[PDB]
Design a protein around this ligand. Sequence first.
Ligand code: NA
Lengths: 54, 232
Amino acid sequence: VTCNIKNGRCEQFCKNSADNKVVCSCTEGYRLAENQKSCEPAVPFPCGRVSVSQ
Amino acid sequence: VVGGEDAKPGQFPWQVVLNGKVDAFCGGSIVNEKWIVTAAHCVVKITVVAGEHNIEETEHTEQKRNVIRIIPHHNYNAAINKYNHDIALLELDEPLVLNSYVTPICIADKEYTNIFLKFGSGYVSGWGRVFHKGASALVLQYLRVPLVDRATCLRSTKFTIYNNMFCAGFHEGGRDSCQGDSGGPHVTEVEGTSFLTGIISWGEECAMKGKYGIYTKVSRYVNWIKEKTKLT
Ligand code: NA
């Protein structure tokens, strides 16, 4: 489990941490989810997201 | 964009169009409610339109704003080379109202912006010409372009390509950015979230076999973008 393997399973950003663990993170307007890997919107219109029905 | 497809409304909600003496002379991307990032060679009185889809139809998602400040990158010098350090920021007169049609593009740090460019596939969009020396698009066009290796990119043109630029496109031609798309976004989708990886800059002949589109590497400028456009 390292950031160089599948991004540490982080959806957006990964940082290597202590004891062979990783810390995931997200860009502005998102919150790191309870699963510790995913990025969830934390504002009404977060960056880079398509929200109109396609 | 040559060889692209019509976007659906709200498919590229960070895209803006720059209008001047000619409409759709360049593109740009929304950094936040008050700031647009574009190419420095694009930027006279400029009107920015966010929420645009069909440039010949007055729809209901468009937000038009005036530009109050132009910040070309401090290393940009058009007297030396119109296309080196080809990036600029535009401050809008009044903030955009963010919604499903008017949404910023994400901008990662330098390291991740470079990682995302290394994925090798980005989307470009714009209202530029739909053929080399052809008409501009009415409906926003988009196209997925693959990253081209550096040596191939250098062998394709007589002009010097520095390490702050990259090439993208197809060996067979037929699909490329074109005039009027300059300044718009090259974005990489990361698990459903798009990140800005390049600025559409220039080329010699749109979609010509053996030629490629040239783009500004955004990773080199993210710190400058974040500092200049910070709202808090
Ligand atoms: Na329109």
